[PDB]
């Protein structure tokens, strides 16, 4: 029916836009993690020595905890660029008040980074540098405090999240639903945001009934996690507060300073 059809068109536009925006998809990521891909396997980083030997297969651009954390920074910065491009493809997003565009991204990007990082993660580790590395969870836990506790909440969220076995086509809409959140602090004009999100939420619902018809309210569980995501971010911001105070021989990439300044 035509109401359903408009919401299919939206699901397809978003999916296409997601594939162009984001180099490594959950499809490819999963392949790499299960060895299904016939492509060269990722260099495994499990200790100080493997990390040193790994520098050839990844891009670093003094101590190991600081250098890992700086690598995370670089991943985030590139993710923020990709997410910003994907946001601009969300019908109606660019017609919003530019100050609102900036507020939605400012509060949205980390929730989306952690959603999309779950695609790169299993209980044992995370793909890095577009899946040409694999950094073990144990190694990231092993780091000296406060860096030791930095990635563990993201793994904890990822193992739960990956159970829903969403694919790209699903994640494309879910990610847009997160960006268009009408309740972010300091929004000037909530109504056109809620109007777009209402449409995205209908597309997400239709999408979760068609692409997983053996599932049932996959839709309802997914909306609950949108609150799990905000706590990862709240918790993550506090840890950045700690890290920025306790350490002095590292600054934050300027893009991440903009985002984190006057955030929770």
């Amino acid at each position: 029916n035509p109401e359903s059809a408009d919401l299919r068109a939206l699901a397809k536009h978003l999916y296409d836009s997601y594939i162009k925006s984001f180099p490594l998809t959950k499809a490819k990521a999963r392949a790499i993690l299960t060895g299904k891909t016939t492509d060269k396997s990722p260099f495994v980083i499990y200790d100080m020595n493997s990390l040193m030997m790994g520098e050839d297969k990844i891009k670093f651009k003094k101590e190991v905890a600081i250098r890992i954390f700086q690598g995370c920074q670089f991943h985030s910065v590139e993710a923020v660029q990709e997410i910003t491009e994907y946001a601009k493809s969300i019908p109606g997003f660019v017609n919003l008040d530019l100050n609102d565009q900036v507020t939605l991204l400012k509060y949205g990007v980390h929730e989306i980074i952690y959603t999309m990082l779950a695609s790169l993660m299993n209980k044992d580790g995370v793909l890095i540098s577009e899946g040409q590395g694999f950094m073990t969870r144990e190694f990231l836990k092993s780091l000296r405090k406060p860096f030791g506790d930095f990635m563990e909440p993201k793994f904890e969220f990822a193992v739960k999240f990956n159970a829903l076995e969403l694919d790209d086509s699903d994640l494309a809409i879910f990610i847009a639903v997160i960006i268009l959140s009408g309740d972010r602090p300091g929004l000037l004009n909530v109504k056109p945001i809620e109007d777009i999100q209402d449409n995205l939420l209908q597309a997400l619902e239709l999408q979760l009934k068609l692409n997983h018809p053996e599932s049932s309210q996959l839709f309802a569980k997914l909306l609950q996690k949108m609150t799990d995501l905000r706590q990862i971010v709240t918790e993550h911001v506090q840890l950045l507060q700690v890290i920025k105070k306790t350490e002095t021989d590292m600054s934050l990439h300027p893009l991440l300073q903009e985002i984190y300044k006057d955030l929770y």
Partner: peptide, 11 residues
Amino acid sequence: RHKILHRLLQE
């Protein structure tokens, strides 16, 4: 304020 985000959004 949010100079880089503005730049990425206006690019």
